[PDB]
């Protein structure tokens, strides 16, 4: 995503040190190494599958790549443990949301389009006690579910969907993605099940905002994001560059306000572009 733009924003140079906080499939890390291989790059991801790809990459690039497995909230401890001082990095990249592995693997439970266990945990099986999306929709009460769908999913029909979920789970536990998708569609007339931007575009399933809401909750993505941003700021050197890619308004709003220092003259705001993602880049002063 925006690979030419991200790399151009980071402007990597010989001898510089980078932190890729969202290694994913390695797309951005490999594009950085391709523009400049004489760097050090710390590659972090909370997802075992992505971290393993970074480890595999580190065998091709042993001097350059250090793979780490952890959440944004864990990054500071992982870095300090690796001997990285604050004020080290020339650039930090955050490409937010989901990887292709998570969305294209039915068993991970992220897609309404492919049936699988309603898991949705970005951490995979790393934390067996971490609640799944099934645990969320099976345990929480109606007003809690409605608050999640409204706040994290911006879903206007939060209450009607939350009621549908509690009704449905009373009959039988909600354990799989297509099951949940059809329970959500049930709270609407059969005609409203698909939305679309215009007459020619792809049908989008009505449960799409509910799935995003569940994913953000299960993975604590917005609270995690704020912690990752503070960690990015602490570990950047002055003059180092932060590049963030946002894919919905809630994360973009958190990046915007963090950069303005009005979460409650620290950054030079050098790029705002959409590409769908919104890229924001900034230089630490």
């Amino acid at each position: 995503v925006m690979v030419d733009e991200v790399v151009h924003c980071l402007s990597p140079q010989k001898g510089q040190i980078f932190l890729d906080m969202t290694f994913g499939s390695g797309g951005h890390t490999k594009a950085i190494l391709q523009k400049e291989s004489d760097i050090v790059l710390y590659a972090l991801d909370r997802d075992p599958t992505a971290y393993a790809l970074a480890e595999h990459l580190s065998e091709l690039y042993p001097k350059q790549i250090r793979a780490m497995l952890g959440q944004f909230s864990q990054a500071e401890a992982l870095l300090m443990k690796a001997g990285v001082q604050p004020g080290t990095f020339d650039g930090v990249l955050m490409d937010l949301g989901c990887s292709s592995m998570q969305l294209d693997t039915p068993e991970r439970g992220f897609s309404l389009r492919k049936d699988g266990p309603l898991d949705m945990r970005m951490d995979g099986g790393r934390y067996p006690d971490m609640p799944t999306a099934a645990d969320v929709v099976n345990a929480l009460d109606q007003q809690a579910l409605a608050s999640i769908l409204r706040t994290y999913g911006e879903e206007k029909h939060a209450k009607k969907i939350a009621s549908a979920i509690v009704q449905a789970r009373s009959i039988y536990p909600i354990t799989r993605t297509q099951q949940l998708a059809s329970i959500v569609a049930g709270a609407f007339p059969p005609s409203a099940i698909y939305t679309r931007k215009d007459l020619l575009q792809r049908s989008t399933h009505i449960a799409t905002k509910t799935f995003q809401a569940l994913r953000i909750f299960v993975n604590n993505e917005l609270n995690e994001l704020y912690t990752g941003l503070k960690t990015a700021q602490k570990f950047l050197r002055p003059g180092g560059r932060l590049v963030a890619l946002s894919f919905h308004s809630l994360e973009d709003r958190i990046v915007k306000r963090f950069l303005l220092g009005i979460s409650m003259l620290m950054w030079e705001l050098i790029h705002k572009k959409v590409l769908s993602a919104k890229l924001r880049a900034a230089i630490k002063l």
Partner: peptide, 22 residues
């Protein structure tokens, strides 16, 4: 913790549920 949803309180509700399911 910070975005209007109390993850700690809600997680504890879920963990009681998961213990009941054991």
């Amino acid at each position: 913790s910070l975005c209007g949803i109390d993850h700690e309180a809600l997680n504890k509700q879920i963990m009681e549920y998961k213990r009941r399911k054991d």
